[PDB]
Give the backbone structure.
Amino acid sequence: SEMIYGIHAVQALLERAPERFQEVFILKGREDKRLLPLIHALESQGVVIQLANRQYLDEKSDGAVHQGIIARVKPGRQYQENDLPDLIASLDQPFLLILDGVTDPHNLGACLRSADAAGVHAVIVPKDRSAQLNATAKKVACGAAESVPLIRVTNLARTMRMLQEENIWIVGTAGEADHTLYQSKMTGRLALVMGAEGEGMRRLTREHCDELISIPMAGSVSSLNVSVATGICLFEAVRQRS
Amino acid sequence: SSGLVPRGSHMSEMIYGIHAVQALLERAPERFQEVFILKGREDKRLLPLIHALESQGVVIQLANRQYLDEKSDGAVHQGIIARVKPGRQYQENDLPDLIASLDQPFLLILDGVTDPHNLGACLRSADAAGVHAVIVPKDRSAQLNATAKKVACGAAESVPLIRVTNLARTMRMLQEENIWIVGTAGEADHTLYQSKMTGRLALVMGAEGEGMRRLTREHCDELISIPMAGSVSSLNVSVATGICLFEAVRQRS
């Protein structure tokens, strides 16, 4: 049993895994047009709602910015490297995001938020030397933690080959690319790879890519933050995929 | 009986990071006055720098770390000091002329970004996209402080940030100058991909909270939304700003 607080986590679950709802706790006495459009959905879902004072919610959350809402939820299905091939098989047209070198919990959250926004089916990351999904990541993820699975993998190159033996085209961003993000084809079976802000993808990672793209800069000094680069690339795909 | 007038002083400003010392070298070399580095101490990352500096005819002097950390308020200078002239601070009144010197102005308007970190993150993306100027309302925006300047990775020294008195009025001026204004809002009825983002243009982004002010929204020529996959999905102002700014870039290239 897991405890979630916040409207962004209560809702990401209503949109994605409403079946994970067991019992809801909301402030007994304080109307908010920020909750009814949720309270009703919960009622429609057949989720048992429960009346509780403010103390009942100040304790069972460790003084969090619950905004008046907390629920009892069944832990979310955590995908391991092993069950990736099945996840992919259940996908009509895989749209994946691979992060090589994201060590900062905050960036992991931002990338997760954007992947969700983009409709990415899963975020794949190097099990070793990569940030962890802690309180802060989830927080910056704005609920994305609950929607987009994050699969931690032993060897990136091995997993990439698996994806390629499964017809998923791998396109990675890199300065030493010959064409730009806009001269790429981001339709079909796809996996987008972003590397750390300074070092980029590790040499091995970029060699396991079918293609390499670069984001065009207007300034030989102009650079881009990682979570913004991820977004720009992901939505260029969203654009071509619509 | 008279009238006194400050004759006028000239005070230098010390810079610190490679993302300033090496950024301002190419971003704004003419402001350079004196430069400091470690004495007789090899640094393979300093040579590619102290190279372009000598070519520009800028003085380069060696010194201690006490000297560096003292004239640097014990800051992460990275062994590279730099005494330079004050930076040109663009003001509202300067706007008309800046726009006059551009054939196809590409402006970014930030309404309500009150967090310096976001302000700096946004400038960085603006600089990457070729934005000529970022315009924010004086009474509803963050200050280009040190925190902002750092998250901007140098852009702060390349992209003018003009603080304005009446955002809506400044917007009417932009339109009088034939600049098309596109604002980002959930209330829009088409996406940024269905928008014509070429020509004279200003992109308006609102903060994550209350979003764009109603008056700002009403002075836009068009409103666009960023398509979300699921009623859940939502974007950070910096990422969102980056996304819209680059869809524009794609279109005008």
Notes: Chain B touches chain A at residues 23, 26-27, 121, 124-125, 127-130, 153-155, 158, 193, 226-236, 238-240, 242-243, 246-247, 249-250, 253 (CB under 8 Å). The domain at 87-253 of chain B is CATH 3.40.1280.10 (Alpha/beta knot). Strands of chain B lie at 13-14, 32-38, 59-63, 83-84, 106-111, 133-137, 161-164, 180-184, 201-206, 222-224.
